[PDB]
Amino acid sequence: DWRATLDPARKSWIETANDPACDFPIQNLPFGIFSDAKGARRPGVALGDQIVDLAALARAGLVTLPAGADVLAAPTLNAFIALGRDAWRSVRVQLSALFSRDDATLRDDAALRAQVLVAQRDATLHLPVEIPGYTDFYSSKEHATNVGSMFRDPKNALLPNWSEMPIGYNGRASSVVVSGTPVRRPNGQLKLPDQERPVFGACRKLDIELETGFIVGKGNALGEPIACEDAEAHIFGMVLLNDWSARDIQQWEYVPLGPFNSKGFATTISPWIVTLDALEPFRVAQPEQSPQPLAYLRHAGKHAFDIALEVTLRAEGAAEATSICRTNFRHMYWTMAQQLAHHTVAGCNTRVGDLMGSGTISGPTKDSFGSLLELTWNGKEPVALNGGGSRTFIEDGDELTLAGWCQGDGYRVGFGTCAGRILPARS
Amino acid sequence: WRATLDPARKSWIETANDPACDFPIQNLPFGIFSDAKGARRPGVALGDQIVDLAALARAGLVTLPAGADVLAAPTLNAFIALGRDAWRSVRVQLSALFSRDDATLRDDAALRAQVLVAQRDATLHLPVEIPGYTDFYSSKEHATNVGSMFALLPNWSEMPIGYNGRASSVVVSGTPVRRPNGQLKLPDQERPVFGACRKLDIELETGFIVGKGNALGEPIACEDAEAHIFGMVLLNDWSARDIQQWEYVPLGPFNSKGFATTISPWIVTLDALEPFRVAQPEQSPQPLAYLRHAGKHAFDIALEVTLRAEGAAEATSICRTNFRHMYWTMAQQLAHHTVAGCNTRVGDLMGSGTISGPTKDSFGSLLELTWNGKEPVALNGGGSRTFIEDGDELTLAGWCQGDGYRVGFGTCAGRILPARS
Numbered sequence: 001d002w003r004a005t006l007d008p009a010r011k012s013w014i015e016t017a018n019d020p021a022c023d024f025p026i027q028n029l030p031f032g033i034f035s036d037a038k039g040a041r042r043p044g045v046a047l048g049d050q051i052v053d054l055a056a057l058a059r060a061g062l063v064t065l066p067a068g069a070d071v072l073a074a075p076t077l078n079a080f081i082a083l084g085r086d087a088w089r090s091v092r093v094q095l096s097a098l099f100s101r102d103d104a105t106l107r108d109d110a111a112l113r114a115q116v117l118v119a120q121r122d123a124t125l126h127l128p129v130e131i132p133g134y135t136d137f138y139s140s141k142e143h144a145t146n147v148g149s150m151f152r153d154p155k156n157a158l159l160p161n162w163s164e165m166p167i168g169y170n171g172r173a174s175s176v177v178v179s180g181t182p183v184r185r186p187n188g189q190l191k192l193p194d195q196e197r198p199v200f201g202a203c204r205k206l207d208i209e210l211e212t213g214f215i216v217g218k219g220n221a222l223g224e225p226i227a228c229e230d231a232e233a234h235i236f237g238m239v240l241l242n243d244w245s246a247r248d249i250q251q252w253e254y255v256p257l258g259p260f261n262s263k264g265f266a267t268t269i270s271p272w273i274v275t276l277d278a279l280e281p282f283r284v285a286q287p288e289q290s291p292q293p294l295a296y297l298r299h300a301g302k303h304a305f306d307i308a309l310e311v312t313l314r315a316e317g318a319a320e321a322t323s324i325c326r327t328n329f330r331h332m333y334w335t336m337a338q339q340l341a342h343h344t345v346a347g348c349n350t351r352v353g354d355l356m357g358s359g360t361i362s363g364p365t366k367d368s369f370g371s372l373l374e375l376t377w378n379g380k381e382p383v384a385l386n387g388g389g390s391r392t393f394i395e396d397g398d399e400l401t402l403a404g405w406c407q408g409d410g411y412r413v414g415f416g417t418c419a420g421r422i423l424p425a426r427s
Numbered sequence: 428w429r430a431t432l433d434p435a436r437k438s439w440i441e442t443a444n445d446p447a448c449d450f451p452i453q454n455l456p457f458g459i460f461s462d463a464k465g466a467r468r469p470g471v472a473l474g475d476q477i478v479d480l481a482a483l484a485r486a487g488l489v490t491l492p493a494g495a496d497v498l499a500a501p502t503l504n505a506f507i508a509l510g511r512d513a514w515r516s517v518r519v520q521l522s523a524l525f526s527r528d529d530a531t532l533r534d535d536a537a538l539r540a541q542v543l544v545a546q547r548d549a550t551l552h553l554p555v556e557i558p559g560y561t562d563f564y565s566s567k568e569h570a571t572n573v574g575s576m577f578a579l580l581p582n583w584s585e586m587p588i589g590y591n592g593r594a595s596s597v598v599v600s601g602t603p604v605r606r607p608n609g610q611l612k613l614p615d616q617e618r619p620v621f622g623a624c625r626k627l628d629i630e631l632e633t634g635f636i637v638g639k640g641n642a643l644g645e646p647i648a649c650e651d652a653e654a655h656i657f658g659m660v661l662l663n664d665w666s667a668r669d670i671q672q673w674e675y676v677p678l679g680p681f682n683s684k685g686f687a688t689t690i691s692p693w694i695v696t697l698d699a700l701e702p703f704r705v706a707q708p709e710q711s712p713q714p715l716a717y718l719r720h721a722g723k724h725a726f727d728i729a730l731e732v733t734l735r736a737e738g739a740a741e742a743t744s745i746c747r748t749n750f751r752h753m754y755w756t757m758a759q760q761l762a763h764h765t766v767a768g769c770n771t772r773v774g775d776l777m778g779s780g781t782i783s784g785p786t787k788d789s790f791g792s793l794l795e796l797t798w799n800g801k802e803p804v805a806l807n808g809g810g811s812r813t814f815i816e817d818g819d820e821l822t823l824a825g826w827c828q829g830d831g832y833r834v835g836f837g838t839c840a841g842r843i844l845p846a847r848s
C-alpha cells in the first residue's frame with residue numbers, strides 16, 4: 001500500500017514540493033514538532049515550503065488514526081510513534097493521497113487550507129521527540145582510523161575490537177537540542193604540553209562531528225535482545241546529528257571511561273524525522289565486512305542508505321558559507337541494524353524516541369572527513385574560507401550547518417538542516 | 428527543620444523506635460509504592476509502615492504549596508521539582524505529626540488504617556523517572572586496584588572522572604537481573620566468541636538524585652552544588668567484566684554495564700544525612716579552583732554487601748566499607764558534570780563509582796575481592812565464589828550510625844537469572 005507513496009512520478013498541488021531541489025517533496029513526508037502564533041507546539045509534516053498541521057487535519061476528519069488517546073495534542077511525537085508501524089504507514093498513505101495533485105478534497109477548500117497548513121517561514125521547530133536515551137556509535141572506519149592515528153602508530157590505529165563489534169558509548173540526552181539553538185563554547189580543563197598541571201579555561205579546539213542518528217520506533221524489554229534481522233522494524237526514522245566536541249577537553253579527560261564533558265555540553269539534531277519508509281528507494285549494499293562478524297551481527301540484504309552529506313561553515317557576517325565536507329552515509333562500516341542488535345545483545349532495553357548516533361562520518365578523501373580535527377589534521381592544515389580567511393577549529397560567531405539528502409530522478413528526499421551558531425564562553 | 432534531626436525524638440509508631448530500624452523518625456525517606464488499596468504513588472517510610480502522602484493530604488494533615496497535585500503522580504519528580512522549602516515543609520509536618528506525643532493521627536484508629544500501609548503489604552517502585560544517569564569513579568582505592576590489573580593516571584586526581592550511564596536499564600531493588608550474553612575475548616583465541624558472561628559482578632556504589640536542575644550553558648558552582656541534590660540511594664552497577672575488557676577501549680564501558688543497574692527504592696534526603704556530615708579526605712594535589720569547596724562534604728555511611736546462593740539459609744558478608752572515604756565529593760562531581768555547560772534535570776541519577784576501602788574486606792566488587800578470580804571468597808554455610816552464579820542474590824545495605832538509632836537506606840537487592848540460550 002505504502003510503496004505507492006514512493007512513486008517518483010507523484011506530485012503535489014502544493015507546488016513548492018515539486019521543485020526538484022526541495023527537500024520536502026511528496027515522496028518524503030518527514031514528521032516534526034512545530035509551533036506558530038496559531039498554537040502551541042504540536043505534530044506536523046513538511047511538504048514543499050509548508051507544514052501540515054496533523055491535529056487540525058484530524059479535527060477536520062481528513063486523517064484518521066487508531067481509536068484511542070489523542071497523540072496529536074502532544075508536544076512531542078513519542079505517543080504517535082509508539083502506535084507502531086501500521087499507524088506510521090496509514091498516516092503516510094492518507095497524506096500522500098490527500099496532497100496528490102489530483103485530489104481536490106483539501107486542495108479546492110481554500111478556507112480549510114488556511115486552517116491546516118502553516119508556512120515553514122511562520123513556524124518554529126522544536127525537538128521532534130523526548131529523547132529517553134542517546135547512544136552514539138563509532139562506525140566510520142575512515143574516521144576511526146584517522147583519530148586512532150593521532151594516539152597510536154599507523155599499524156595500531158584501528159584496534160581489533162573495532163572490526164568485531166560496533167563500538168559505542170552512552171551520550172548525554174539532556175543536552176541534545178534542535179537545529180538553530182545557539183551553542184555556547186564550553187569551559188573546562190585543558191592540558192598544555194609544557195605544563196605539569198591542567199589549567200581551566202575556554203575550549204580552544206571546538207569542533208563539529210558530522211553524523212546521522214536514528215530514532216527508535218519500537219522498544220524492547222529489558223533482558224530481550226533485538227535480533228539483527230528484526231532491527232530495522234524497530235527504527236522510525238533518521239535525522240542529522242552534530243555531535244559538538246571540545247577536543248582539548250576531550251584528550252585530557254577521556255581515558256579510561258571515554259568522552260564525557262567534551263561532548264555533553266551540546267549535541268544538535270535536525271528537526272524533521274525522515275522516515276525509514278521514505279528512505280526505501282535509497283537502500284544500497286553496505287560495505288563488505290572483513291573479518292566476517294559473529295553470527296548475532298550478520299544480516300542478509302541491503303542495509304546501507306545513499307545519503308549525500310555536506311557541512312558548511314559561515315563566519316559571522318560572511319555573505320556565503322564554505323563547504324568543508326562532502327561525504328555519504330552509505331560508507332558506514334556498521335549498519336543501523338547491527339548497531340541496534342549490538343546495543344541490545346546483553347539485554348539492555350531501548351525505548352520509543354531513543355536517539356542513536358552513527359559516529360562521525362568520514363569518507364576516504366581529504367574533503368570528505370566529518371570533523372575539523374580530521375580536515376585540518378589537528379590544526380596543522382587550516383581550511384581556506386570562501387570569501388577570505390581561514391580556520392583550524394571553530395571560532396566565536398561561526399555558524400556550522402549539516403545538510404543531507406537522497407538524490408532521486410528529478411526529486412530528492414532531504415533532511416533539512418542541522419545548524420548552530422557559537423556563543424562566547426562564560427567568563 | 429533541624430529540630431527534626433533530634434536524636435531524642437521518637438514516634439508512636441513503635442517499630443520506628445527500635446535502635447536497629449532503618450526508618451526511625453529521624454530519617455523519613457521518600458519513595459513510590461503501590462498496594463491493593465491503590466496505584467503507585469508517593470510515600471514515606473517510618474518503622475515497618477509507609478505514610479501514604481496523598482491520603483494524608485486528603486485528610487488535611489499535610490499541606491503543600493497551592494498548585495498542581497504532585498501526590499497523584501506515579502513518580503516523585505513533580506514533588507521534588509517544588510524545591511527545598513517544600514521538602515522541608517513536608518518533613519517538618521511529618522516529624523511533628525508522628526512524634527510520640529501528637530495525638531492527632533495516633534488516636535484516630537479509623538484514619539490510621541487509611542493513611543498507613545505496612546511495608547509487608549506494599550510494592551516498591553523506582554522512586555523517580557530518571558532523565559539521565561551518570562556514573563563517576565571517585566574511590567582512589569578502587570581506581571588503583573583496577574588500574575593495577577591493566578595505575579592511577581594523573582587526570583584521575585585532577586578531576587572526578589565519569590561517564591554517561593544507561594538510564595533505561597536502571598531498576599528498583601528486587602528486580603531479577605538476567606545474566607547477559609555478549610562478546611568474550613579468550614586469552615588463547617585470536618577472535619572473540621559470543622556467549623554467556625562468565626565474570627558477572629556487582630559494583631557497590633551510592634547515587635544521588637538531583638533536586639534542582641540547571642540550564643544548558645549555565646554551570647553549577649561547586650559551592651552551590653549540594654543545594655541541587657535531593658537525596659541518596661544505594662546503587663549496584665552490575666558489570667559483566669569479560670564483556671567489558673573486550674569492548675571498553677577507547678569509548679568506555681557500554682553493554683557491559685547497560686544491561687542492568689539496581690537502586691534501592693527509598694530516597695534518603697540530604698537533610699536527614701546532615702548529622703553524619705564529615706570531613707572528606709585531603710586532596711593532593713590541590714584541585715583547580717572550580718572544584719574546591721569549604722567545609723565538610725563527605726558522609727559517614729557504613730556500607731555492606733552480602734551474597735546468598737540459591738537456597739542458602741544465610742547470606743555471606745563480602746564487603747564492609749564506608750562512603751566517607753570517597754576522594755571526590757558529590758558537590759565536586761556535580762560541579763564537574765556542569766562545568767562545560769551540560770544541563771542536569773530533576774530526577775537525574777549520579778553514581779559515586781565503586782566504593783572500596785583500604786583493606787581486603789572493604790573492596791566494593793568481586794573483581795577486586797577475588798583479584799579477578801584468583802582468590803575465591805569462602806561462603807558462610809560452605810562453598811565458594813569468584814564471580815556471581817545463577818540464582819545468587821546480591822544485596823547492598825547502608826546506614827548511618829547515630830547514638831541509639833540509625834538512618835538507614837533499606838536494601839538494594841537482586842537475584843541472577845540464567846542467560847538466554
Ligand code: NA
Pocket residue numbers: 242243244245262263264265266267268
Ligand atoms: Na556533543
Ligand code: NA
Pocket residue numbers: 663664665666683684685686687688
Ligand atoms: Na550495570
